[PDB]
């Protein structure tokens, strides 16, 4: 078990034997572009590295096998990364998003630990045996901060230093080592930022840093070298290898570097998701992003109410809490030209339209269970009947309101007609109605019809691309891009009141979150909201978000109130379409290619 050095340079993570020389070759990796930060798990014999050109964090065994991209979403510049080898967690710092995030070595249960008051955090060093994490911030007045490995107890450890890199922990002597890139020095301190000593003051430009036994190894971008020296006096310097320009990270791969123990290593602290280390040598259970910790301090609960705004290449989730949690990009693959989204709160599964692939797809929030429900046919918008478990959606090609089941089997075409172009759709199954836009040439309109295409009337005629609906407020909302404004009305058609119409360029989406009206401006790249109770007024939620496509609010499904709808219990006995009448009973109906039968429930052909 011979100790050796490992360093990243361009697209090569390479190995340099310390004692004598052997295996001075690169680690056989396939798709590396710009390797940066490095760490390892010595018992699993695996290496972990980041990539800026790819915006990824990958892991692979020492022989290049089992190369997998652990983190591949929501990364901008992961210049720092470290491995919790006891709790088996992966920490990293991003200077583009300015946040320190944690997950597992597998990659699941990604959580943001620090996100406030961060100014470009880069170097990262962990100490799970004591429950502390240390990092360096390169922003205005750079500094070195310490926090508990769950994000709490964050203080400033070194305030006077310059831009620090190569933060390395000597666990035996209990000391910190780092390099000052502005004064071009190598310094050390104790675990509290005190007893500060200057290890080396005459080096050209030390950059990366690591420590092993009584020796300190550093890189030099001026001399383009890897050197080592006595960690105490700073002398007995030898050049390990030269002609190495722009070596990003460097470290010693040896078991003695990863010792210690906490409860997370023994039993994962009996936590459901994350086990994070805290002082002193203790632990607390952590949850995925947007998840909350239950009363047992062990299990995590997914968020029940939230927002979902999707752009051309991503689908994101917003959460409103007092701590102002950051938005999360849902790790769903094969997202090309997204145009609409919806969500089923019963099975808790997300649905969306993909225009490029030209299909409607569903998947869980973590990305699992990818299922294609319909696949020429150009779907435009969609809306879910969560009671009949149906999806109503318009087609841009056939110009038709078509309805399909969640399992993919079509119930049939509900609306069709010449000189008709139905685009946006929203369903109100509590009242058995559906509202949609009809963009006829030189004649737009907003129409309502029953969930079977009958009782088709015209609601809004003159003065005019997305509809929102709220039954609690009894209000219908829409937004026009030509006139560039947003309007509201009642479900019956009365009180057509114009909302805030100024400072709007190109509205695309609308939803109702509690007593608020969220809408997205695509060209202005904004997510805003209007207070529905008329108290706080117009407010900007987020600015400069490109390629926006849709937004969808999600309230928690009260299953007690859900089971009360007669359309939900075996579809009210109706094959196909169940309709709710004024009195509250049900009445069956069917698409245009079928006809109701004697039992007033089933349907079929005719002759």
């Amino acid at each position, epitope marked *: 078990p011979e100790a050796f050095l490992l360093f990243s340079r361009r697209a090569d993570i390479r190995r340099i034997s310390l004692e004598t020389n052997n295996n001075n070759v690169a680690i056989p990796l396939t798709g590396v572009k*710009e390797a940066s930060a490095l760490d390892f798990d010595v018992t699993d014999n695996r290496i972990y590295w980041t990539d800026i050109s790819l915006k990824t964090i990958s892991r692979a065994f020492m022989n290049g096998s089992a190369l997998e991209h652990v983190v591949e979403f929501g990364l901008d510049y992961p210049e720092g990364m470290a491995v919790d080898w006891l709790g088996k967690n992966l920490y990293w710092a991003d*200077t583009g998003t300015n946040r320190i995030e944690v997950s597992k070595l597998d990659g699941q249960h990604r959580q943001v630990l620090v996100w406030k008051d961060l100014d*470009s955090p880069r170097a990262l060093a962990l100490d799970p045996a004591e429950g502390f994490m240390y990092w360096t911030e390169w922003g205005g007045k750079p500094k070195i901060d310490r926090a508990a490995m769950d994000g709490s107890e964050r203080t400033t450890l070194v305030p006077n230093v310059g831009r620090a890199n190569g933060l390395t922990i000597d666990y035996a002597k209990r000391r910190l080592y780092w390099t000052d890139l502005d*004064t071009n020095l190598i310094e050390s301190s104790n675990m509290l930022g005190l007893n500060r000593e200057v290890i080396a003051d005459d080096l050209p430009h030390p950059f990366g840093l690591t420590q092993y036994q009584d020796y300190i190894y550093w890189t030099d971008w001026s001399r383009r070298s890897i050197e080592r020296a006595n960690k105490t006096s700073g002398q007995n310097r030898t050049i390990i290898q030269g002609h190495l*320009d722009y070596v990003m990270d460097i470290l010693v791969f040896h078991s003695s570097r990863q010792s210690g123990w906490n409860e997370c290593a023994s039993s994962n602290g009996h936590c459901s998701h994350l086990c994070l280390a805290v002082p002193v040598g203790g632990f607390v259970c952590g949850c995925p992003a947007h998840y909350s910790l239950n009363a047992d301090n062990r299990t995590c609960s997914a968020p029940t109410t939230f927002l979902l705004f999707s752009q051309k290449s991503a689908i994101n989730r917003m959460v409103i809490d007092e701590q102002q949690s950051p938005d999360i990009i849902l790790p769903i693959h094969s997202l090309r030209n997204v145009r609409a989204i919806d969500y089923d709160p019963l099975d808790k599964q997300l649905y969306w339209i993909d225009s490029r692939q030209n299909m409607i797809r569903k998947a869980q929030e973590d990305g699992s269970q990818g299922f294609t429900v319909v696949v020429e046919i150009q779907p435009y918008d969609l809306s879910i009947d969560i009671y009949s478990r149906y999806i109503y959606w318009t087609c841009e090609a056939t110009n038709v309101i078509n309805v399909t089941r969640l399992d993919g089997r079509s119930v049939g075409v509900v609306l069709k007609g010449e000189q008709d172009r139905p685009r946006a759709v929203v369903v109100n199954p509590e009242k058995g109605y559906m509202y949609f836009t009809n963009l006829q040439e030189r004649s737009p309109k907003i129409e309502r019809a029953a969930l079977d295409g009958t009782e088709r009337e015209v609601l809004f005629f003159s003065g005019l691309i997305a509809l929102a609906l709220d039954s609690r407020l009894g209000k219908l909302f829409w937004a026009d891009s030509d006139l560039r404004r947003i309007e509201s009305s009642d479900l019956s058609g009365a009180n057509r009141i114009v909302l805030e119409d100024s400072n709007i360029l190109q509205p695309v989406g609308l939803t109702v979150f509690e007593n608020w009206l969220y809408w997205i401006d695509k060209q202005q790249q904004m997510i805003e909201k209007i207070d529905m109770t008329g108290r706080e007024g117009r407010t900007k939620v987020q600015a400069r978000i490109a390629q926006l496509s849709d937004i969808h609010a999600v309230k928690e499904l009260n299953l007690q109130e859900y089971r009360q709808h007669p359309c939900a219990q075996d579809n009210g006995g109706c094959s196909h379409i169940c309709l709710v009448k004024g009195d509250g009973t049900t009445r069956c109906s069917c698409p245009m290619h079928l006809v109701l039968l004697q039992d007033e429930l089933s349907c079929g052909a005719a002759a």
Partner: nanobody
Amino acid sequence: EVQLQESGGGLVQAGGSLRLSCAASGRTFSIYTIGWFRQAPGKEREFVAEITWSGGSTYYADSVKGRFTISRDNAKNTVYLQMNSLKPEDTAVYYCAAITYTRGIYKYWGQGTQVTVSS
């Protein structure tokens, strides 16, 4: 990513002086060094001088050593090249170049400024 904007420079008599400026915008916290290059109408790119982003280290080529003085502003994100004892051999287009700790060798370039020395 970093964007550089060169400014200053023009028609200057022989034996005079002229101060060049280079404004860095973007991820300037990640800047390692800033180097000045120049392109003559005949010769190709020539390396002139470099300075670390903290101003602690500096390097001048022997072609301009003793005359030119590369520096960084005391606050702003700009670097200056003070050119003294100008010769007709210095007539060229001067380029600012940034090398960052992130992305490493990837050089972010500016558009450069034209400098002419008449005699």
